[PDB]
């Protein structure tokens, strides 16, 4: 069926502007003529996404000069700066680089974010520990929709409902989960048999992995 329950709960419509990139070690005139050859031009592709993959920015890799060894923290809006025409993403495919820039079209009633951890480097797999700072109360996503599709949408405010955190190295980690109780508004963190009440204040103080948001 075109619209199953999972489709109407999580699936959304999103738009990719894929532009082929010539080899960077090419003459400027040759690069320009290849761009004019209609092969390295932008193409629009619509697609359906069950979730949005959030690419964490690069770690500092060096101690902070003033307050040494500070864990990096990124606002949620910088990660959300994706999915718009202003920001691109040079995908470094082993064959050739691609200039793909995304753009949201139709937000799902419920949103799933997956923060990309456990990225395999050239020799092994390491976990990015960068923490994302987000307003748990509400977020605004109307600013990340094109002007054509903002007329249909009326509810773009999202509130955090579920949070997943991975604690430890990728080799051996623990998956903890915070859930928002609709009846009381309280956040409860449960790990295996352990169940505890957690204040919403330190929800963002963890390595968020999967976020479930409700448009209300």
């Amino acid at each position: 069926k075109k619209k199953t329950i999972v489709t109407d709960v999580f699936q959304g419509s999103m738009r990719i502007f894929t532009k082929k990139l010539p080899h960077p070690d090419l003459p400027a005139e040759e690069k320009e003529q290849l761009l004019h050859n209609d092969e390295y031009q932008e193409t629009m592709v619509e697609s359906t996404f069950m979730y949005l993959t959030l690419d964490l920015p690069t770690a500092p890799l060096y101690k902070d000069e003033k307050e040494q060894l500070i864990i990096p923290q990124v606002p949620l809006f910088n990660i959300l700066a994706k999915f718009n025409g202003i920001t691109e993403k040079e995908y470094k495919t082993y064959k050739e680089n691609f200039l793909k820039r995304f753009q949201l079209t139709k937000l799902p009633p419920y949103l799933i974010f997956c923060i990309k951890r456990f990225t395999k480097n050239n020799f092994f797999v390491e976990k990015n520990p960068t923490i994302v700072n987000f307003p748990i109360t509400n977020v605004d996503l109307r600013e990340y929709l094109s002007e054509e599709v903002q007329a249909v949408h009326k509810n773009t405010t999202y509130d955090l409902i579920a949070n997943i955190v991975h604690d430890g190295k990728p080799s051996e980690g623990s998956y903890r989960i915070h859930v928002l109780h609709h009846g009381t508004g309280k956040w409860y963190e449960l790990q295996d048999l352990q169940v505890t009440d957690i204040l919403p204040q330190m929800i963002t103080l963890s390595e968020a992995y999967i976020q479930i948001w409700k448009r209300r």
Binding site: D25, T58, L61, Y62, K63, D64, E65, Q68, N121, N122, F123, F124, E126
Partner: protein, 329 residues
């Protein structure tokens, strides 16, 4: 039956089962034929000759080729006889003895040509009339069973012993069937097919080595601990190359060593776990150096955690390797 014949039985069975189990389907081939393009070339001629004549001709030709290889650097003090035994003509000096060293391939070729010389000489002796056909067959069987004793070509390729231990086994397989009834133990057997085919099957595999070795050796122009130091240096070079490609080197050639010094300083700062921030360095250059440092750090960590675990297992490692690994750890 004695123990030796039984062990010969199990060894023959072991070799047969290994051949059968490790069998692979022949690879698709375009059917390019030897001895067919030779007659196409205007260098070879076809005829029909008695086999003993061809054997004598090939023995002479192989002797001539080996003699040509021996006198390669005009060193005329290594006499090679007609039975393919190489010996110094005199008490050669130690400098000459070092200067007259030939690889295992040459001596393997010499001993294999000696074996063919023995076969053709047995045929010639039969043709002359010194030995009967029964004696010729017995001599051929003794050749194919006692190659190690007669030639000793295993000294230059020990895998060849696999053939010898087989051939001897075949002898123990045959004699105790040959000499069973009223015929007593003696040197009368002449069933040489088994050893002959075993040595031919050795030849079909040893031919490419000698062919390529002599083709490189007789050609007009001669031709001829890296795990850890494989990714690091290249990585640096790559990064360096990139910068010098986009650096306007015709205007800024003097900054190549500056860039390399910055790379080394960033690597040292990461290794010392101390903050690193060049204030005047351009942002794209800083990103370049940061990505290079991240890749080098990942390689460094993986290499350390690979060498340490190799050493823990009892692997044979050098001394400087241990010191470097200890520093990294």
């Amino acid at each position: 039956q004695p123990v030796k014949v039984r062990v010969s039985y199990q060894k023959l069975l072991k070799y047969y089962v290994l051949n059968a189990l490790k069998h692979r389907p022949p690879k698709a081939q375009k059917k390019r034929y030897l001895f067919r393009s030779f007659k196409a070339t205007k260098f070879f001629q076809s005829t029909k000759l008695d086999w003993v004549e061809v054997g004598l001709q090939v023995c002479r030709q192989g002797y001539n080729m080996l003699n040509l290889l021996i006198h390669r650097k005009n060193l005329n003090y290594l006499h090679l006889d007609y039975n393919f035994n190489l010996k110094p003509v005199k008490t050669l000096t130690t400098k000459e003895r070092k200067k007259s060293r030939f690889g295992n391939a040459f001596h393997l070729c010499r001993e294999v040509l000696r074996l063919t010389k023995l076969v053709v000489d047995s045929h010639v002796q039969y043709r002359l009339g010194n030995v009967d056909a029964f004696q010729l067959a017995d001599g051929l069987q003794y050749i194919f069973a006692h190659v190690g004793q007669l030639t000793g070509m295993y000294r230059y390729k020990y895998k060849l012993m696999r053939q010898i231990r087989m051939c001897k086994d075949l002898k123990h397989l045959i004699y105790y069937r040959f000499n069973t009834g009223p015929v007593g133990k003696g040197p009368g057997c002449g069933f040489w097919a088994a050893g002959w085919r075993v040595w031919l099957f050795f030849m079909r595999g040893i031919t490419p080595l000698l062919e390529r070795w002599l083709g490189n050796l007789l050609a007009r122009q001669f031709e001829g601990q890296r795990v850890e130091s494989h990714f690091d240096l290249e990585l640096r070079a790559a990064v360096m190359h990139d910068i010098l490609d986009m650096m306007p080197e015709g205007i800024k050639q003097n900054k190549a060593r500056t860039i390399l010094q910055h790379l080394s300083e960033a690597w040292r700062c990461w290794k010392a776990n101390i903050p690193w921030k060049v204030p005047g360095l351009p942002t794209p250059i800083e990103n370049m150096i940061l990505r290079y440092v991240k890749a080098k750090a990942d390689w460094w960590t993986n290499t350390a955690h690979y060498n340490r675990e190799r050493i823990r297992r009892g692997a044979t490692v050098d001394k400087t390797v241990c010191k470097k690994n200890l520093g990294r750890l």
